[PDB]
Ligand binder design. Structure first.
Ligand SMILES: COc1cc(/C=C/C(C)=O)ccc1O
Length: 328
């Protein structure tokens, strides 16, 4: 069978927490007053929720209301419990309230307002300094949730909300997040296609926090090279081929051999043989002001096939790439 794996950090955080902390199925929801919130306009609809701008009429302040679509009581409690555990942590979206929506008959999560700048337009203007700054802010959120025993599992530009005016960032949509338990096998159908780690793409279930670091690397590559998304696969199989055309096939085989993983035989016809590439080939006159040896080395240390070889969030914050970022 497959060789087992463990997170190299924060391995036993939930092991030594009290059970109430991670046993979300037993969580009892404290409901607020739904009449406190007046929906103003619909902001978006996803597979699992609808999101509204609203006003809290007890203080006339803007809030965001996330009305959950019907799904397992468990997935709902999971998100709720994770948001409550992480509340107050650096750059984590703040759950302010939970109410029963009378129409959907589901929970509506109430969040602090976040004034977004759309990432497709935002990523067009970000300077070298901006990219470093906001990456550091994302790392704070990831080190925090990882240190608290939780992996996000859906890190992507859409879930990183940025108020560029006040240089404020929030990591949102914890609906796919999970508690890390050593030796636990997880569903590989998480994250958006372009941000799925190799572990998901080769069906290795015993993954951990380090999955988020691959996704972060994909975000970094799209930003400093001005190519979004960076690995642009047409499906989950082609997604792995796109990655192997950059990282090379021999290290992919080293990866799956280490964990005694077997590739889907459907790869026999499409994978081919590919050298590992140097990151400089993606640099050109239109993105070179965003690239430095520090950026390339940092990217290189995030985008590793072997989830155990990737930088942890904390190690990432130690990287010379962030030396120029002003510390508060
Ligand atoms: C889709 O999930 C979330 C969305 C938002 C805000 C979205 C906005 C302001 O467009 C906040 C928290 C969430 O969990």
């Amino acid at each position: 069978g497959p060789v087992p794996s463990r997170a190299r950090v924060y391995t036993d955080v939930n092991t030594h927490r009290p059970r109430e902390y991670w046993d979300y199925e037993s969580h009892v929801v404290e409901w607020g007053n739904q009449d406190d919130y007046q929906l103003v306009r619909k902001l978006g609809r996803g597979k699992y929720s609808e999101v509204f701008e609203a006003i809290n009429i007890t203080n006339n302040e803007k809030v965001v209301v996330k009305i959950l679509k019907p799904v397992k009581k468990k997935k709902i409690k999971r998100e709720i419990k994770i948001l409550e555990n992480l509340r107050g942590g650096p750059n984590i979206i703040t759950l302010a309230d939970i109410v029963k929506d009378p129409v959907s008959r589901t929970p509506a999560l109430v969040f602090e307002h976040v004034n977004n700048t759309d990432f497709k337009q935002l990523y067009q203007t970000l300077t070298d300094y901006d990219i470093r700054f906001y990456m550091y802010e994302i790392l704070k959120a990831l080190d925090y949730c990882h240190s608290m025993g939780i992996m996000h599992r859906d890190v992507k530009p859409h879930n990183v909300m940025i108020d560029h005016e006040h240089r404020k960032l929030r990591l949102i949509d914890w609906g796919l997040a999970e508690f890390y338990h050593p030796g636990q096998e997880y569903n590989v159908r998480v994250a958006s296609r372009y941000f799925k780690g190799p572990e998901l793409l080769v069906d290795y279930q015993m993954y951990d926090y380090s999955l988020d670091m691959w996704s972060l690397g994909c975000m970094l590559a799209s930003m400093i090279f001005r190519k979004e998304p960076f690995f642009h696969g047409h499906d989950n199989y082609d997604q792995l081929v796109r990655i192997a055309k950059v990282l090379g096939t021999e290290d992919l085989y080293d990866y799956i051999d280490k964990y005694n993983i077997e590739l889907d035989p459907r790869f026999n016809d499409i994978l081919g043989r590919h050298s590992r590439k140097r990151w400089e080939r993606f640099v050109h006159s239109e993105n070179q002001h965003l690239v430095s040896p520090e950026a390339l080395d940092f990217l290189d240390k995030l985008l590793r096939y072997d989830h155990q070889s990737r930088l942890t969030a904390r190690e990432a914050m130690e990287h010379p790439y962030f030396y120029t970022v002003v510390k508060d």
